[model samples]
Target: MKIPLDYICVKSGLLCNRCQSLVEKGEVENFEVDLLKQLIELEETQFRELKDSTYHKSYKVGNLLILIVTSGSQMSYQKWIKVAKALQEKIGLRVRILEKSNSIKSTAVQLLTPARVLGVNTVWLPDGTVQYVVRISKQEKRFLPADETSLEEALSKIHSTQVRIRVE
Candidate 1:
């Protein structure tokens, strides 16, 4: 994968001066290194095309390991499922692949996979800031990867914005 850190640095598991500085600056985390190693090995053995994809960040939410990849990754939903399955088998954790983006709606849609997002709207509070409300169908609620509250908390932590879920 197109990781920010150097290939040698990741392979050796020893951060060089530059790589160490990135970790110190909070640009890279130790957990990400482990994920990168698995991804690299996967690339060599099975997913060769993943080498070009950019690795963004990862979030552990309950039993799920949410991997946020950059827009550069061009894999179909089925392909994502295959990769997630492999990672889950190897790491002994449930995996979810999310495409990273600046748009809260886009990110939320990916996070709520298997459950369709009907719409997303913003509400302007008297405090002069806006809050986002994500709409989903009641029938698809069971397909949500995480609980509503956990999804809201993760969204808030990532975007620094107030988020709520609305079932319609």
Candidate 2:
């Protein structure tokens, strides 16, 4: 039996056929859409801000369990690390950290540069595993600073976002 493809799927931002085709064919790495835009809007109806809520949905790319971390405080960074470690010990997948920015022409250059002054404080550690590329303009702080934050937070935030892709 052929099931009709729902035009309105909550799973994938309801990415239309053209977008999905581009994704499937490696024509695009990420679709430019807010992951929790709807959930955030719904929460706004009741509260001024959304916090302490996990509206993330997970997807798998081969053995990798791609988790979407939408909103998190410093505490969220800790959880990201713990989760990555668990995945490594149990699933044999190395964690990679990537700090992506839409403002720059090249992710390779944007991530390493601060959003404001393109400061030198940003550092991309060895192993090609991005360490600190996140900066909070409102907070006036960078998430990835040299010897910054509690050891736990620092440890957790250190990893790679890149993963190995193998075809069968």
Candidate 3:
């Protein structure tokens, strides 16, 4: 699906005017709510709460690391690039991104390796409330949102190799 120009920005990483407007109001209109609910339920499963935090259920899958990006600040291209570089040396030699926002069905079929990256999201949270996670290995160090880079560059640096799940 085409990402809305108004909502997704690879350059400034700013939400489009329409989404921004809705967010400032602290409530979603009925039409928007109904639409989002469908997407949120697509992968809906009980996420047991972790501790007392509003957010919960953090898990790791091999070199593919997934964690919450708690920063309210936006990321810069340079910082994000640094992360991509570090991930290359640390995680296996590849990675793939699966966002809760909207990913094509082909994404899963395209993943070739074991470090499958996926994010579970909820529409009940405010816009941009979803966490950003990177699946990496123990060989790598964790980087925060402060380390920003061009979204394209970050996505490009990682490689995805094919793996056979069922060898029948």
Candidate 4:
């Protein structure tokens, strides 16, 4: 899998100036370097299925770590889950992989499957930022990937915006 940081910088643990600058630049997170490094090693030997994947960023939601990666080959979830299984074992946190998407709506729909999403709407805050609202009806509430709040929290970080899952 391709990552933002170089292998050398990731290996050293003491990140180079460029890597550290990227952290400050918000291109990557400080805590994610080690995991990205481990991913490179993991990709090298065990999971070549990730060869066509490009990592976007990661989010820590509650006890779960949500990893965002773009699939160059349009890989299926079954294969991705197999890869995630190994990652979960190695990383010590429950792992869930979400494909990089154009909007929170599409990604949420993907994550919150089995239940048809009623719709996605948005609101503008006074601060001039957007809060995306994902609408699912009360009947589909139980079909969420996890509890609605955790899913919202995960999407909030992954999308870098405020997200709400509205179960009406």
Candidate 5:
């Protein structure tokens, strides 16, 4: 995969100067290094798409491990679900794959899969800041991949903006 770390560093489990610099600078985590190694090992046989895709970050939400892949837009929904299932089995954690994007709305929509987004409403606070509220159908709330509050937190952090997920 097109990760920030060098391919050799990931494959050999030994960090090169550049890779070591990233770790020292706190740009990369040890667990992320290990995860990249695991993904590289699976690329040849199990997940061919990993060879071309790019990775961004991983978030641990409850029992779920959400991976934000920069190039996830290349894969179909079926492929994403299949890959998530495979990664869950391998990593021993529930997996959620989100395609990284510039728009928070689109990213949140992807993260809340199985739970359709009805609409996105913008609220202008008196403080001159804006908050985006994502509306989900009440009936589909139960189908959200993660709890609404946690998903809201994830969306806010990922986009660096105030966001809310509400069922209405």
Candidate 6:
């Protein structure tokens, strides 16, 4: 996977003069650096599918850390689940990786695997705050990543407003 920091700086923990600005200027976070090492280390072994992936962004929702990445190569959903589970075990903080998507609908789809998003709509509040509602069938609720509550929380954290799920 491609990351902002160089592999040498990440592995050695001592940034060079050029790579020093990422941390000094507040571009990268402390925990994200540690997490990047694990992810970078995994690139050579079982996660060949991530060879063409690039880091995009991250979000903190409740107790979870959500990573958004862009993948140039097509990958299976099962592979992403396995990757997240492995990192979650090592990091101790609930970690999830989501492929970068342009729309909220696709983001919701990636968050809930083995399930489908029936529809998505916007709810306009009187004060002009817009909320997103993602509809999923009741039967597919069990197929979500961890649970419904966290999924909505993660989305809301990533996109701002109060994004939520509606079981139909």
Alpha carbon lDDT of each predicted model: 0.81, 0.34, 0.29, 0.81, 0.79, 0.80
Tens-digit lDDT track for model 5 on 1-168? 788898888888788999999988867766667668767777766777766788886666566676788654456667777877877777877878888788777887888877789988888889989889999999989899878898888888777789997788
Cα TM-score per model: 0.85, 0.25, 0.20, 0.82, 0.85, 0.77
Model 3 residue 125 distance off true place after TM-score fit, in angstroms: 21
Instruction: Output the TM-score of candidate 4.
Output: 0.82
Predict model 5's lDDT versus the native: 0.79
- Residues 1-168, candidate 4: write the lDDT tens digits: 688997877876777898889988977875577569768878777777777789887877776877888876746678788777878887787777788887888888877776779999988889989999999989999777688899888888777899898888
Query: What ranges in model 2 sit over 4 Å off?
Result: 1-23, 27-70, 73-75, 102-168
- Per-residue error at 138 for model 1, in Å? 2.6
lDDT of 2 by residue, 108-136 (tens): 33222233323222345676544333333
What's the CA error at residue 10 for candidate 6, in Å? 1.2
lDDT tens digits, residue span 27-94, model 3: 33322332222212221322111111111111124333322121112333343334334444444432
Lowest summed lDDT window (length 10), candidate 6:
71-80
Task: Write model 6 residue lDDT over 65-164, tens digit each, in one string.
Answer: 7888886565566777787887888888887778887678788877776688889998889999988999999988878766788888888866766888
| Candidate 6 regions with alpha-carbon error over 4 angstroms | 16-21, 24-26, 74-78, 125-128
Superposed Cα deviation of residue 154, candidate 4 (Å): 2.0
Model 1 Cα shift for residue 102 (angstroms): 2.8
Superposition-based RMSD of candidate 1 using all C-alpha atoms, in angstroms: 2.2
Kindly report which residue stretches of model 1 are placed more than 4 angstroms away from their true locations once superposed. 71-74
| lDDT per residue as tens, model 1, 1-168 | 788788888888887999989888877766667777788878789876786678886766667677888634556667777888988888877887887778899889988887999899988989989899999999889999889888887777567799899988
Which portions of model 5 show Cα errors greater than 4 Å?
72-74
- Tell me the deviation in Å of residue 78 in model 6: 4.4
